[PDB]
Amino acid sequence: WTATSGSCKGRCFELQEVGPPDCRCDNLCKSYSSCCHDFDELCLKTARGWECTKDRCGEVRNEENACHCSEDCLSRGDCCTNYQVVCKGESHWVDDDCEEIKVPECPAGFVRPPLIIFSVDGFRASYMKKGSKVMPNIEKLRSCGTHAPYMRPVYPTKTFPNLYTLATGLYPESHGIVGNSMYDPVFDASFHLRGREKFNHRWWGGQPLWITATKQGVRAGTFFWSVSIPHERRILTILQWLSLPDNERPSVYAFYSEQPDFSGHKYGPFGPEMTNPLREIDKTVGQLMDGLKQLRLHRCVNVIFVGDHGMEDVTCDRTEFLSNYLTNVDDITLVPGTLGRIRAKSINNSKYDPKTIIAALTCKKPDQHFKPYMKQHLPKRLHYANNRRIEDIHLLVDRRWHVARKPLDVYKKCFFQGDHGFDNKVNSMQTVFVGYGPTFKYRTKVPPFENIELYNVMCDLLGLKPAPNNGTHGSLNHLLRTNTFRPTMPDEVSRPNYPGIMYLQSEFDLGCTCDDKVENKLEELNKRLHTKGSTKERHLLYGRPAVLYRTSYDILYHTDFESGYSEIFLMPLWTSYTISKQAEVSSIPEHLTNCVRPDVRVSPGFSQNCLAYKNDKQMSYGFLFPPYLSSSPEAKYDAFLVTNMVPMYPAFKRVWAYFQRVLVKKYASERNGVNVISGPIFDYNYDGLRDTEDEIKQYVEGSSIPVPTHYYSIITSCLDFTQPADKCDGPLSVSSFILPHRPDNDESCNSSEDESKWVEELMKMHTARVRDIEHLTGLDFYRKTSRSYSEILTLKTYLHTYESE
């Protein structure tokens, strides 16, 4: 119950929310149905519109007007935004030349440059170039400030998951807003775009920027604007707040526009109807900048222009229906559209079986426009599994398509021409970032980056300590003129052992065999050198990875590769090798097909054994350093060491063998050499973080050999490909992947074909940042380079997306 009988007199858009049942005059009062009786009258004036005209100049103040053109409006903080232009002969901000803001130029009493986040819904990255002719204010911010060609949103590429990621620095699986629609089974409660439940605080996890600021003594304006408040009034409210006394004035503000998303859904991303919404958003930017210029704040405030996601062409006819696949369609609940999430309709139905639903959805139609996954098998770069609100069964929908349960859902539940929600590497889902102000760089273009990184930067801009988040703090230092965050590298927790030769061959009883007893001071001294690390500088180019947790491991050196061998997991944590452009590929000799060799530096008790693989009828093995890329027949024997072996399902060995035999050489040819680090990953609780030994759910039958959930490779070369990977004087170039270690290739519908037709496609889908691999392994890479630490942090956040230009 709201006692709407109180008054908003002098309380309009008050910053502190008054507690029930007193009536409210803050911005959220509309949403709660709780505004005081006179909120519209006092707080939402529209009389005479939003612009001064010549005849209004120096008018007598009339408090009825939406905004003012009287001589007292500046000191009142409530002129129409074009007041100085119409009445005082001033220029619009957009008509003024760009001039570098070398230092903040702030009115007295300003303790720090304020930050204004101007957020636009559905603003696709390519609008910056394609609409630049009708967005002169935005184009000036872009060209004069710091801008990326695009910014990558989080998955799913929906509004609230992305806005809340902007606010928190967290993946949606961590902040809890995992869709615009959700069921939480612990709460037994449903979140929807419409209604009141969505405001309940239990949905919203982590710590958004306005709470971070407030806890640290920095005041914040409204982030969530009620839809019915017009944009001109939002701008006027921000400008009014900026005129408050020092002790009352917020330092951080947000504006939000529902456009161009609103029209994009109706007309498609490039519908001729789209030019007008773009002009209108630009005009709003112009109002804000003119207003800042009036307040003498246009060279003091940092402004961020940022979108939540893009927009793709999608129509009703491009819908796949689950009723064309499933017999049991009425026993499931589907969350539909540009992604699908499936759960049982009733928890009392014990005939419900995820495995038969996945199977009925897998490669059933030749041009099928969605792919089903158990959530733990989705690409790890989506970071979309570790939350009870994410259903176990997920459908990844191809761009331009929808999925629905039944046809009647699409006409009785074509209207639309645009939608979004798809895989966040898809080009049409990319959105915008521009930063303009004293703290941002001048006329500077930065490479694309992910929106999870912005919270840290916003905290840097405000002098706040960020709450723990998923950005990599320092990775965006190159956007900033000042206020950079200068991190130190994490400390190594576990130092390696460097074992020498300590075991005789007969101490081992591993059930392995090798045809290797085939017999020199010329060549024996040299091989001893190789086992002590004499080639290490060729194969370990950026220092050894640091192990950031407590464990027992050995560094093992070889002619062609170096490894960090875990005595706990019985296999390498990492294996590092360099392949020059000139390297040659060779086969595994006939006599060495089943060759596995005890490693005399590592005890029998800390070694794998061949018998376990013999007896595990489902599991085979592969090697981390590939025998195919051996530098010489003699060095090839090193590749068959038991310490270079890892468990691999036959189906996965198809993928891995093609990568090692074909693709590594292809990359070395194209990139002028590559350095490769490969290894296993164990993430059985799908939290994106390295499993401890007691979280392992599967072992090679009868043994203590843990089965990886994934295998990674980090492939580094010189950004200037005129220099070979091993003699690179400057910046680096990286691509990485995290391949799921699965016992079938059901994910690849074309897997009956030659690996050349499907393997690299799979690997592209499972592209990864080096940072993703760090989280999953407890390793820290690139510890010894000639590059700045912030540059290396940006490299570790790089994702190679394989999308066209």
Ligand X SMILES: *[C@@H]1O[C@H](CO)[C@@H](O[C@@H]2O[C@H](CO)[C@@H](O[C@@H]3O[C@H](CO[C@H]4O[C@H](CO)[C@@H](O)[C@H](O[C@H]5O[C@H](CO)[C@@H](O)[C@H](O)[C@@H]5O[C@H]5O[C@H](CO)[C@@H](O)[C@H](O)[C@@H]5O)[C@@H]4O)[C@@H](O)[C@H](O[C@H]4O[C@H](CO)[C@@H](O)[C@H](O)[C@@H]4O[C@H]4O[C@H](CO)[C@@H](O)[C@H](O)[C@@H]4O)[C@@H]3O)[C@H](O)[C@H]2NC(C)=O)[C@H](O)[C@H]1NC(C)=O
Ligand Y SMILES: Cc1cc(OCc2ccc(=O)[nH]n2)c(C(C)C)cc1Cl
Residues near ligand Y (CB under 6 A): 117, 119, 163-164, 166-167, 223-225, 227, 254, 256
Q: Which residue is nearest to ligand Y (CB)?
A: 256
Nearer to Na ion, 302 or 751 (CB): 751
Residue 72 is assigned to a ligand binding site: no
Concatenate the DSSP letters of all residues of 452-506 into one string: GGHHHHHHHHTTPPPPS-SS-TTTTGGGBSS----PPPPPP-BPPB---S---GG
Which of 53-61, 259-267, 720-728, 732-740 is the region at the interface with Zn ion (rule: CB under 5 A)? 259-267
Report the partner that residue 303 touches, choosing among Zn ion, ligand Y, Ca ion, none (CB closer than 5 to 8 A by kind). none
Report the partner that residue 164 touches, choosing among Zn ion, Ca ion, ligand Y, none (CB closer than 5 to 8 A by kind). ligand Y
Nearer to ligand X, 381 or 671 (CB): 381
Which token pair is 404?
């629905």
Dihedral Cα 621, 626, 627, 631, nearest 10 deg: -160
Residue 685 is assigned to a ligand binding site: yes
Instruction: Give the shortest CB-227-to-ligand Y separation in angstroms.
Output: 5
Report the partner that residue 616 touches, choosing among Na ion, ligand X, Ca ion, none (CB closer than 5 to 8 A by kind). Na ion
Nearer to Na ion, 28 or 749 (CB): 749
Chain-centroid distance, C-alpha 705: 33
Nearer to ligand X, 755 or 780 (CB): 780
Nearer to ligand X, 48 or 710 (CB): 710
Instruction: Give dist(CA 626, CA 638) in Å, integer.
Output: 10
Instruction: Give the shortest CB-224-to-ligand Y separation in angstroms.
Output: 4
Report the partner that residue 261 touches, choosing among ligand Y, Zn ion, Na ion, none (CB closer than 5 to 8 A by kind). Zn ion
Nearer to ligand X, 432 or 776 (CB): 776
Instruction: Give dist(CA 441, CA 102) in Å, integer.
Output: 9
Nearer to ligand X, 176 or 310 (CB): 176
Instruction: Give the shortest CB-420-to-Zn ion separation in angstroms.
Output: 6
Nearer to ligand X, 152 or 775 (CB): 775
Q: Would residue 81 show up in a list of annotated catalytic residues for this protein? A: no
Instruction: Give dist(CA 216, CA 219) in Å, integer.
Output: 9
Among 26, 261, 282, 774, binds Zn ion (CB under 5 A): 261
User: Rule CB under 5 A: which residues touch Na ion?
Assistant: 613, 616, 619, 745, 748, 751
Convert 24-78 into a string of H (helix), E (strand) and C (coil). Answer: ECCHHHCCCCCECCCHHHHHCCCECCCCCCHHHCCCCCCCCECCECCCCHHHHCC
Nearer to ligand X, 470 or 716 (CB): 470
Instruction: Give the shortest CB-770-to-Ca ion separation in angstroms.
Output: 18
Residue 159 is assigned to a ligand binding site: yes
Instruction: Give dist(CA 750, CA 371) in Å, integer.
Output: 13
Chain-centroid distance, C-alpha 339: 17
Residue 302 is assigned to a ligand binding site: no
Instruction: Give the shortest CB-471-to-ligand X separation in angstroms.
Output: 9
Q: Which of 252, 241, 245, 243 is nearest to 217 (CA)?
A: 252
Report the partner that residue 625 touches, choosing among Na ion, Zn ion, ligand Y, none (CB closer than 5 to 8 A by kind). none
Report the partner that residue 232 touches, choosing among Na ion, Ca ion, Zn ion, none (CB closer than 5 to 8 A by kind). none
Q: Which residue is nearest to Zn ion (CB)?
A: 261
Instruction: Give the shortest CB-761-to-Na ion separation in angstroms.
Output: 12
Instruction: Give the shortest CB-204-to-ligand Y separation in angstroms.
Output: 8
Instruction: Give the shortest CB-339-to-ligand Y separation in angstroms.
Output: 20
Q: Are 706 and 563 in contact (CB under 8 A)?
A: no
Instruction: Give the shortest CB-175-to-ligand X separation in angstroms.
Output: 6
Farthest-apart Cα atoms in the chain, separation: 106
Convert 713-759 into a string of H (helix), E (strand) and C (coil). Answer: EEEEEECCCCCCHHHCCCCEEEEEEEEECCCCCCCCCCCCCCHHHCH
Q: Are 249 and 241 in contact (CB under 8 A)?
A: yes
Which token pair is 479?
């956007």
Instruction: Give dist(CA 545, CA 677) in Å, integer.
Output: 10
Nearer to Na ion, 240 or 703 (CB): 703
Instruction: Give dist(CA 514, CA 644) in Å, integer.
Output: 15
Let me know how long the chain is.
805
Q: Apex CA 281: angle with CA 275 and CA 284, to 5°?
A: 140
Residue 683 is assigned to a ligand binding site: yes
Report the partner that residue 748 touches, choosing among ligand X, Zn ion, Na ion, none (CB closer than 5 to 8 A by kind). Na ion
Tell me how far apart the terminal alpha carbons of the chain are, to the nearest angstrom: 55
In this structure, what are the phi and psi dihedrals at residue 130, rounded to the nearest 5 degrees? -65, -30
Residue 265 is assigned to a ligand binding site: yes
Residue 420 is assigned to a ligand binding site: yes
Nearer to ligand Y, 150 or 223 (CB): 223
Report the partner that residue 691 touches, choosing among Ca ion, ligand X, ligand Y, none (CB closer than 5 to 8 A by kind). Ca ion
Instruction: Give dist(CA 570, CA 605) in Å, integer.
Output: 9
Instruction: Give dist(CA 396, CA 375) in Å, integer.
Output: 10
User: Rule CB under 5 A: which residues touch Ca ion?
Assistant: 683, 685, 687, 689, 691
Instruction: Give the shortest CB-217-to-ligand X separation in angstroms.
Output: 20
User: Rule CB under 6 A: which residues touch ligand X?
Assistant: 170-171, 173-176, 205-206, 383, 386-387, 468-470, 687-689, 775
Q: Which of 721, 717, 760, 704 is nearest to 737 (CA)?
A: 760
Instruction: Give dist(CA 649, CA 663) in Å, integer.
Output: 20
Q: Which of 268, 306, 235, 229 is nearest to 81 (CA)?
A: 235
Phi-psi domain of 275 (left: phi exceeds 0; alpha: psi -120 through 50; beta: other): alpha
Report the partner that residue 163 touches, choosing among ligand Y, Na ion, Ca ion, none (CB closer than 5 to 8 A by kind). ligand Y
Residue 261 is assigned to a ligand binding site: yes
Contacts of 745 (CB under 8 A, 6+ apart): 651, 654, 655, 751, 758, 762
Chain-centroid distance, C-alpha 212: 21
Which of 146, 159, 165, 785 is the catalytic position? 159
Residue 509 is assigned to a ligand binding site: no
Beta strands in 490-649, from DSSP E residues, in sequence order: 546-547, 553-557, 562-566, 571-579, 620-623, 645-648
Dihedral Cα 80, 81, 84, 86, nearest 10 deg: -70
Instruction: Give dist(CA 149, CA 163) in Å, integer.
Output: 20
Q: Which residue is nearest to ligand X (CB)?
A: 205
For residue 712, the cross-strand partners are 679, 738
In this structure, what are the phi and psi dihedrals at residue 409, rounded to the nearest 5 degrees? -65, -30
Report the partner that residue 167 touches, choosing among ligand X, Ca ion, ligand Y, none (CB closer than 5 to 8 A by kind). ligand Y
Where do breaks (C to N over 2.5 Å) occur in the chain, by preceding residue number? Answer: 413, 519
Report the partner that residue 206 touches, choosing among Ca ion, ligand Y, ligand X, none (CB closer than 5 to 8 A by kind). ligand X
Instruction: Give the shortest CB-122-to-ligand Y separation in angstroms.
Output: 12
Binding positions are 121, 159, 180, 261, 265, 308-309, 420, 683, 685, 687, 689, 691
Binding positions for 1-tetradecanoyl-sn-glycerol 3-phosphate are 159, 180, 261, 420
Binding positions for Zn(2+) are 121, 159, 261, 265, 308-309, 420
Site of interaction with Zn ion (CB under 5 A): 261
> What are the residue numbers of the active site?
159
